[PDB]
Subunit: 45 residues, 3 copies
């Protein structure tokens, strides 16, 4: 039972890391879009 | 105690799934904004 | 062992809350970019 719990915890932590990676990927792309909007606005103004 | 731990684990996994859903929703909207920026830039150029 | 598991669970839940905060931050910024795109498109049209 202890080993089952330990395995379950490792699984959850692995999923958490996957989620963290996805968040990092979204942040990077979101930063590119912010930059793109700034450039387009500067042209429009 | 085993049952309490099992319940706690299910709760955590449920929250993880909720988080995964939110990430998926953000990715979809972010994709729309990327497309919108591409169309606006093409008009500006 | 029970205490180790309890500590591990608290750690995981704390990370989950951190993730939730980051998601909330991304959503807010994404909302600003959606608004910016709407304003730029209205000028272009």
């Amino acid at each position: 039972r202890m080993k089952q719990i330990e395995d379950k915890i490792e699984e959850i932590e692995s999923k958490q890391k996957k989620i963290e990676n996805e968040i990092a990927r979204i942040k990077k792309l979101l930063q590119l879009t912010v930059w793109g909007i700034k450039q387009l606005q500067a042209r429009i103004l």
